Design a protein around this nucleic acid. Structure first.
Ligand SMILES: [Mg+2]
Ligand SMILES: [Mg+2]
Ligand SMILES: [Mg+2]
Ligand SMILES: [Mg+2]
Ligand SMILES: [Mg+2]
Ligand SMILES: [Mg+2]
Ligand SMILES: [Mg+2]
Ligand SMILES: [Mg+2]
Ligand SMILES: [Mg+2]
Ligand SMILES: [Mg+2]
Ligand SMILES: [Mg+2]
Lengths: 169, 159, 204, 292
RNA sequence: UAUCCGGUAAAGCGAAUGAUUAGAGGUCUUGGGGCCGAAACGAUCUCAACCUAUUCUCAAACUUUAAAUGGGUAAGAAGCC
RNA sequence: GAAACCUCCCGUGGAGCAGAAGGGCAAAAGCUCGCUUGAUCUUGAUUUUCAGUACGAAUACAGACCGUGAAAGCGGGGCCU
RNA sequence: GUCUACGGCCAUACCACCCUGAACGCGCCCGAUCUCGUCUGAUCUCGGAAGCUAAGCAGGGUCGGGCCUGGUUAGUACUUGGAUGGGAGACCGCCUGGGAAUACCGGGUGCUGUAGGCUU
């Protein structure tokens, strides 16, 4: 009989790290645009790495955050591709979870020989009502303690909500 | 030979005390210095505009000018043989009221009270101060119990 | 090779530790500041025989080594290999300089010759713990080690249990209640203060 | 496991920030600039028209800063506007205007400058500012203290400012962030602003919802529908309120008494009790373990 | 007699910075070498660095503390009301 | 993959602020944007070296013309040396 | 009793976890037409008032850490002035005045200004 300790999805985060810049990256942006229904953002590199073939301030990856119903919908698709299996290690200690998908066409998008096959990275930030305190401007605060989402508490949400398994190992 | 640099040897002088860095609390800025107010300079690292020179740190002096956010202040500085009253412009943050004078003002106020009163009475009262005199004749009552004997203690080597 | 100890005896200079500034310091002769059965519990070695200085002088790193060896060698021959623990309690930190002469006194400021420890009057140099059986052998072990130092030092037997800070008359009583708790060579002192869950680990 | 970030040492070296900075209220960087005087002014005040928008409220205060703690010359709230006419939408721009007006009028009645400095009555919305009349006591002057409000075009803080200005306080302002200014052109309307002042932006949204879907309108404007406040009744309502404010701004409080004087709180536990508690826990721990 | 200033002596390092001994505890990390293991955070040691309480000893160019001696002002008619 | 990008949490500053080092700095003095030319024109006063002369460097004002900001303000080069 | 707004001094106010919060407030909260701003109404801005004290916030708790303040440490360390004092020196004792700091052990754990609520 809890009132508003209702574990919800705060945001879903998506990124395609191509590590190439120029055209490959712009091509991947289109895929994220098709999936989410919103322009994404290019993230540039922190610094040069000669092994990976990237340069400081060169555009490596493209990412985008989705919130609310659209986020819920795209999360569902991602889980359908994964077949509603996650692991113990997939949940973070902070009560969030994430998972990859090995190719975006499995969600529900058409391939193209140009616009190829970009795999991507679902990360789900769970939350609760009254989590905004942390990031609002004026009378900020920390979200108590018996309020923070444990790893276990997010696992049981996922087991309930999306009917998942959470396999061991 | 030493460097003539302005801030040479102010590693500890202009350095905010332990756990008192950060914002300068506002009372500092919002208290009024008139002309002729005795004021004790004390540099402060945070505010760097209008710092006084290291020689005048610790020195007290009187105010002779009051600009927007600074105060001209006559101080005495010694120079080998000769003392030079000289006038420096220090930004408020490096300055306090010297309480030195206030105890005197209190004493004048007490004398004026004690001069208005005790005039219609006739009994003239001690107005001047007087140094701590010899501590008077008095009895010490060793009430019942005798005094406690104190032997010096025998040596032993601890460490 | 190196100078006589004579010249670098008295504590003349300010302390000149090996640091950012003082570098290219050749390493100290003494290195192992303790030996014997150092893996021994408080209760199986209570004696605490110190060698205490009586001059404000400098002991060379070389001297401290020689003294240690001297004391350890005799301890082993006397009682046994694993019947004592010796703690040297002066590390050579102070660096000691050497203006060398193949120009004259122009620009003289030394290179680091070596290291040295400064000792105050009443400060401890070496210390040994063993059994109440073995008082005599400790005394002679330190006596022998005196001859490797300059100046004058007394050998003194403490009123403390082992190498602890706790008076040996009170030790056993403090242990049983649980003011004190064994902790390798040392002994952890538990006070009142700490949350009551710490208290509940003891008394159980 | 990891290195414990917060040791004894950490706390030992740690400096707390100021209380109001911790609490997340006072921007001390801005406060220094805002509030202190030029020393050659000496003991003359420096007033600020504080404006703070709460979730359900709008507070406007005028205050100078004394060393004991900044003193409030005069204050007006949004929850007073029920007296004057405004029933609902009290955190809204139009109410913010009223609050700021009310404040200005209240201040002016204290100094006897109610009759002088009538200010702007018709409510144009345009650039207005109060010239001090010669041979008469000068206009009151204060500065706008926004606080931690992101001052952007159309912030209710400036609504209160506008109200005060129209009330007759010489507060300096541009019109760059009155709602009506166009960022991609750089001119002011002052008809757009007028509408916002008289709740027409609310009224229109009230009309747009009723047209679209009844259920949403009913949800969004429940307390508007209760009390009977229609879209076409809106503009008039605010104009009446302004006139009521203008005619009498004075505050009379309520004569509060008949208090039981009881402790809702919990008093602090005495040393001896705490000293006892631990002894009981110790005893309890011993007696419990001497069984199993 | 009031009232400011100070960072030397001392002290401290279970307080920061830097140095530094030892055992207790810790698969935190992980390793490199082992021994018993096909191999296994399996068992057993080990030495690396890191950490949890403790412990030994230090600093002209470190310091939470912090003296003695010391430097300003002030102690009225150019002042009060 | 120890290192690419994203996310949550801890984080008194252990980073950064052109350079030596010291001080100073967290809804900044750091970073990222937006608009700019107070690094402009002009009297004196003062400080620092001091002989209490210069230079340099600085501090407080005052008069102009500007910038910026909703505004209080801040700005006549570089957080201070 | 206590809160809100703006505060002063800036830990006796900090941190950790635990409990309790009447009424008014403060909040979370529900929306995005307009204003405004985002990759994203998350923040920011705006329009609200269906829920709820879960969280923030307040009050209390912990043989809590920290901080504040006493003791102890100790008349110890150090130190002004003095001697044809000692000592081969290193250093030490005395006289004359001044006099600290850890460890260890206690107590305390925000005060309060202006303006406006509530407990009528
Ligand atoms: Mg020879
Ligand atoms: Mg020398
Ligand atoms: Mg601001
Ligand atoms: Mg010095
Ligand atoms: Mg020293
Ligand atoms: Mg000018
Ligand atoms: Mg700069
Ligand atoms: Mg929202
Ligand atoms: Mg709550
Ligand atoms: Mg609760
Ligand atoms: Mg405590």
């Amino acid at each position: 009989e809890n009132p508003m300790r209702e574990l919800r999805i705060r945001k879903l985060c998506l990124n395609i790290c191509v590590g190439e810049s120029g055209d490959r990256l712009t091509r991947a942006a289109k895929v994220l645009e098709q999936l989410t229904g919103q322009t994404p953002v290019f993230s540039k590199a922190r610094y040069t790495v000669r092994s990976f073939g990237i340069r400081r301030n060169e555009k490596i990856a493209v990412h985008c955050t989705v919130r609310g119903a659209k986020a819920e919908e795209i999360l569902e698709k991602g889980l359908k591709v994964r077949e509603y299996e996650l692991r113990k290690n997939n949940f973070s200690d902070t009560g969030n979870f994430g998972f990859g998908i090995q190719e975006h066409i499995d969600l529900g998008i058409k391939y193209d020989p140009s616009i190829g096959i970009y795999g991507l990275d679902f990360y789900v930030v769970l939350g609760r009502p009254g989590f905004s305190i942390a990031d609002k401007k004026r009378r900020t605060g920390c979200i108590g303690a018996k309020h923070r989402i444990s790893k276990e508490e997010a696992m049981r949400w996922f087991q309930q909500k999306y009917d998942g398994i959470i396999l061991p190992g | 030979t030493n460097t003539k640099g302005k801030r040479r040897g102010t590693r500890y002088m202009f350095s905010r005390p332990f756990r008192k860095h950060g914002v300068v609390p506002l009372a500092t800025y919002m208290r009024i210095y008139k002309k002729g107010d005795i004021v004790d300079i004390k540099g402060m690292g945070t505010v760097q505009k209008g710092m006084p020179h290291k020689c005048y740190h610790g020195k007290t002096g009187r105010v002779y000018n009051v600009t927007q956010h600074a105060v001209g202040i006559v101080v005495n500085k010694q120079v080998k043989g000769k003392i030079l009253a000289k006038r420096i412009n220090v930004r408020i943050e490096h300055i306090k009221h010297s309480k030195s004078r206030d105890s005197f003002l209190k004493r004048v106020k007490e004398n004026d009270q004690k001069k208005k009163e005790a005039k219609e009475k006739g009994t003239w009262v001690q107005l001047k101060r007087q140094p701590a005199p010899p501590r008077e004749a008095h009895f010490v009552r060793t009430n019942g119990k005798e005094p406690e004997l104190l032997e010096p203690i025998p040596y032993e080597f601890m460490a | 090779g190196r100078r006589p100890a004579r010249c670098y005896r008295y504590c003349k200079n300010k302390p000149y530790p090996k640091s950012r500034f003082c570098r290219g310091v050749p390493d100290a002769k003494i290195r192992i500041f303790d030996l014997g059965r150092k893996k021994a519990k408080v209760d199986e070695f209570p004696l605490c025989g110190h060698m205490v200085s009586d001059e404000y002088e400098q002991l060379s790193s070389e001297a401290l080594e020689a003294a240690r060896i001297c004391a350890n060698k005799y301890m082993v021959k006397s009682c046994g290999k694993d019947g004592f623990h010796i703690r040297v309690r002066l590390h050579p930190f102070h660096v000691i300089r050497i203006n060398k002469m193949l120009t004259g006194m122009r620009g003289a400021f030394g290179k680091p010759q070596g290291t040295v420890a400064r000792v105050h009057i009443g400060q401890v140099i070496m210390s040994i713990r063993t059994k109440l059986q073995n008082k005599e052998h400790v005394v002679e072990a330190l006596r022998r080690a005196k001859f490797k130092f300059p100046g004058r030092q007394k050998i003194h037997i403490s009123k403390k249990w082992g190498f602890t800070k706790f008076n040996a008359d009170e030790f056993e009583d403090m242990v049983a209640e649980k003011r004190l708790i064994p902790d390798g060579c040392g002994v952890k002192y538990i006070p009142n203060r700490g949350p009551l869950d710490k208290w509940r680990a003891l008394h159980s | 496991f990891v290195k414990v970030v917060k040791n004894k040492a950490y706390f030992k070296r740690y400096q707390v920030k100021f209380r109001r900075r911790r609490e997340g209220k006072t921007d001390y960087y801005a406060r220094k600039r805002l509030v202190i005087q030029d020393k050659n002014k000496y003991n003359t005040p420096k007033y600020r028209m504080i404006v703070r928008v709460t979730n359900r409220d709008i507070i406007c205060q005028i205050a100078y800063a004394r060393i004991e703690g900044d003193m409030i010359v005069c204050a007006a709230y949004a929850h007073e506007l029920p007296k004057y006419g405004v029933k609902v939408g009290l955190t809204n721009y139009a109410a913010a205007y009223c609050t700021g007006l009310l404040l200005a009028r209240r201040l002016l009645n204290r100094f006897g400058m109610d009759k002088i400095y009538e200010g702007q009555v018709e409510v144009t919305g345009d650039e207005y500012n109060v010239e001090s009349i010669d041979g008469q006591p000068g206009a009151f002057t204060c500065y706008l203290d926004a606080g931690l409000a992101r001052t952007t075009t159309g912030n209710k803080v400036f609504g209160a400012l506008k109200g005060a200005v129209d009330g007759g306080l010489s507060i300096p302002h541009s019109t760059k962030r009155f709602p009506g200014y166009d960022s991609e052109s750089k001119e002011f309307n002052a008809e757009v602003h007028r509408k916002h002042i008289m709740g027409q932006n609310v009224a229109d949204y009230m009309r747009y919802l009723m047209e679209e879907d009844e259920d949403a309108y009913k949800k969004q404007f429940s307390q508007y529908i209760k009390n009977n406040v229609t879209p076409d009744m809106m503009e008039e309502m605010y104009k009446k309120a302004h006139a009521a404010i203008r005619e009498n701004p004075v505050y009379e409080k309520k004569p509060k008494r008949e208090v039981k004087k009881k402790r809702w709180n919990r008093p602090k536990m005495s040393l001896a009790q705490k000293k006892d508690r631990v002894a009981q826990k110790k005893a309890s721990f011993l007696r419990a373990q001497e069984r199993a």
